[PDB]
Design a binder for this molecule. Structure first.
Ligand SMILES: Nc1ncnc2c1ncn2[C@@H]1O[C@H](COP(=O)(O)OP(=O)(O)NP(=O)(O)O)[C@@H](O)[C@H]1O
Ligand SMILES: Nc1ncnc2c1ncn2[C@@H]1O[C@H](COP(=O)(O)OP(=O)(O)NP(=O)(O)O)[C@@H](O)[C@H]1O
Lengths: 373, 373
């Protein structure tokens, strides 16, 4: 049926797509849609199609730079660019559909929890005035369904941070200034905007990256005002911390997870020509981030305990918690542990995530398994 | 022609093999042979065939253990096992062919340099007495064509260390005691043999691993006397040092190179329950091993210099140096730099190895390349 709606754009190559990704599904309240698992033609990974008119493009990759002074000079030759806070949460695309506000996560999933929560952060008025518009933003905070951590200054459950506004079908991105007005017009919370800079501002930008890193914050995104040039640069902190987080589940992750972030550290250290004791300090922190969580996980598997973590979320409607478990099932494996209704306007829900692979590999290994490399 | 000689063992699946590995070639002195690049049937990777009678089986993988107390218990339930020095050099298989002594490296390559040198370490008498036998051993030292380092106690160019004796066609391995007698009968230098131990000796084995590690040595191989049970265990030092060596060419190596050895450290640390300051010390050493060479390689590419290393070997016959360059070409890319004839009975030859990939990736990156993860 939506196979015709797809034809309104591409061919029987839709059939070639039916092979392994780019699939059908119903929504938070039974709103059937097609999610592009893999990217075909001009429709990116994570692209959602509800109908010919409502086509929410996938959020593109954002290129990364490893050296800050270059890369900046390379990309923003002599132009001027905005520097925004890169917030560590999860990517959310927000649309209004038949009066319903929707939260589309990166993969192209209409997510129950997000969907339920967006209204708290985005006024309905916006879409009433702007049907043709999508909001893109980071959902971030201590009580998050996905990421373990977030910005240290968000004290209670999730918060929403806008960083893009796009029109539908096209997915074309509105100018920075335009998006900032929207944000202020409608009172939508927005990623911090540190200012407009040039390649000539690399020194004070170093200073910024320094502060953010001392504060345990992710890093920055650089944007041309016409939203055509976009690059990410993460802090030393993000790199070491990502390693600390992931070392606890070492065997749940591809080796590249670790080496990539080792790179990014080396390059930082090279670029700032850090040496002597400051270098030692960083080396030691790389060591501990790699070893301690790993070793603690080993002691754990050894005490016959499982590798797990408990994380919390707040909901309006308890049945959406259950809806999450099913949504998670479309990916990982989580179970409920405690409901504290003792929350105004809802319930704090504690989930449990298990890490079978991490637990099994460590198990076998400490069990004395012999293997080939 | 040798296609019939292969048929004396397998079928027209030899043709299926002709696809991508298991190939023909001539030797150090034009002795044509077939090298098994990939393993088919009962003939392993690196298996050499000179003719139906002379079939040098490939050296098998040696299984690894990551936890010492277990693994030992798992493999040598209550049995008794020999503990040999694991010597960091390169794997060599030695045969006598029509009066010629041959050095077959792991991959199945008749190696000019090794071939030229074996006579210095293995008496001809041996093969005169034992035509049906192969010697397997580690070639190791400061002036090595392959590995960068070796045992710290080998002061001048390469040395040979026996660790297996096998009969031909079968490749069946002789008992430990039998190989030790051979070693002593013919004066072939052998890997240090620390003793016979049981699972009940883990404590003094820990002490051994401790000393070896403080001495910057690889580790140990454990062998049942009938050579049927074989397992490797490397020192903390080997793990950290392997990281230090590889970090300098970080991008020349698969991420797994680094993570695997991070694991092995974690497990060591867990097993010995190392904590407090001793833990800190190891964490710092992991950090420096991962960062400092990397950073120095970055400063280097940046000073427009190339990532390279100079390594030396000694030869009897100068034309075998050239022969090496061609043999290397069958794999990597090396050039000659200096000949010091000023060596009794030959020449000390300085080679140069380049690392294009490491140099190019670092180049682009410090040049500010923007990329996707
Ligand atoms: N101010 C911001 N502007 C744009 N994106 C932001 C901002 N703050 C946080 N982000 C998020 O940071 C993401 C890009 O950073 P990162 O998480 O490293 O990439 P990723 O999620 O791994 N996928 P990709 O960008 O395709 O490599 C975006 O996809 C957003 O979800
Ligand atoms: N005492 C010894 N007994 C057996 N092998 C030894 C000994 N000392 C050194 N070796 C060498 O050490 C190797 C085994 O250790 P390692 O270097 O981890 O193997 P590898 O090169 O990874 N190949 P594989 O064993 O197939 O995984 C053997 O291939 C030998 O070349």
């Amino acid at each position: 049926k939506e196979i015709l709606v797809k034809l309104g754009l591409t061919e029987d190559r839709i059939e070639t797509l039916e092979m392994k990704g780019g699939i059908i599904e119903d929504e938070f309240d039974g709103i059937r849609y097609v999610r592009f698992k893999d990217s075909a033609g001009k429709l990116r990974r994570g692209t959602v199609v509800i109908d010919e008119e409502y086509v929410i493009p996938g959020f593109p990759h954002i290129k990364r730079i490893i050296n800050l002074r270059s890369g900046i000079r390379r990309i923003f030759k002599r132009g001027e660019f905005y520097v925004e806070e890169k917030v560590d949460g999860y990517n959310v695309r927000v649309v209004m559909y038949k009066g319903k506000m929707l939260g589309i996560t990166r993969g192209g999933f209409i997510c129950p929890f997000t969907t339920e929560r967006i209204p708290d952060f985005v006024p309905q008025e916006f879409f009433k005035d702007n049907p043709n518009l999508i909001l893109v933003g980071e959902m971030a905070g201590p009580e998050s369904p996905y990421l373990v951590e977030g910005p240290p200054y968000v004290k209670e459950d999730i918060q929403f941070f806008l960083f893009d506004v796009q029109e539908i079908k096209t997915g074309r991105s509105l100018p920075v200034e335009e998006r900032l007005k929207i944000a202020e017009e409608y009172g939508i919370n927005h990623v911090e905007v540190f200012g407009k800079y040039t390649k000539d501002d690399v020194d004070e930008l170093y200073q910024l990256i320094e502060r953010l890193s001392k504060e345990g914050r992710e890093g920055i995104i650089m944007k041309s005002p016409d939203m055509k040039k976009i690059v990410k640069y993460v802090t030393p902190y993000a790199n070491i911390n990502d390693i600390k987080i992931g070392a606890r589940v070492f065997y749940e992750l591809p080796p590249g997870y670790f080496t990539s972030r080792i790179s990014r550290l080396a390059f930082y250290l090279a670029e700032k020509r850090i040496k002597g004791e400051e270098f030692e300090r960083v080396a030691k922190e790389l060591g501990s981030a790699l070893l301690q969580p790993f070793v603690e996980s080993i002691f754990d598997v050894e005490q016959e305990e499982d590798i797990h973590e408990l994380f919390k979320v707040r909901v309006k409607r308890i049945e959406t918690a259950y809806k999450m478990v099913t949504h998670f099932e479309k990916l990982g494996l989580k179970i409920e542990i405690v409901d504290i209704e003792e929350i105004k306007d809802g319930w704090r829900i504690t989930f449990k995530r298990l890490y079978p692979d991490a637990t099994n590999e460590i198990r076998e290994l400490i069990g004395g398994k012999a293997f080939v490399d």
